[PDB]
Write a protein that binds this ligand. Structure first.
Ligand SMILES: *[C@@H]1O[C@H](CO)[C@@H](O)[C@H](O[C@H]2OC[C@@H](O)[C@H](O[C@H]3OC[C@@H](O)[C@H](O)[C@H]3O)[C@H]2O)[C@H]1O
Ligand code: CA
Ligand code: CA
Length: 43
């Protein structure tokens, strides 16, 4: 039996060609050129 934090990136929360890196109980988005915001939502 194990405890797993889970992959919070499996829902693809990073938008607009952004890249998702899983973290602990969270994720970070690496945004492409021309996009910003926590989910790369902002032009
Ligand atoms: C999968 O996709 C949905 C929308 O399509 C996201 O909202 C889900 O992320 C949510 O659920 C898991 C939480 O870990 C996540 O919030 C944490 O990670 C991002 C940080 O910006 C935030 O401060 C932190 O609480 C939440 O956004 C995603 O799993
Ligand atoms: Ca995780
Ligand atoms: Ca889009």
């Amino acid at each position: 039996m194990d405890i797993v934090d889970g992959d919070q990136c499996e829902s693809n929360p990073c938008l607009n060609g952004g890249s998702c890196k899983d973290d602990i109980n969270s994720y970070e988005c690496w945004c492409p050129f021309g996009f910003e915001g926590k989910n790369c939502e902002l032009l």
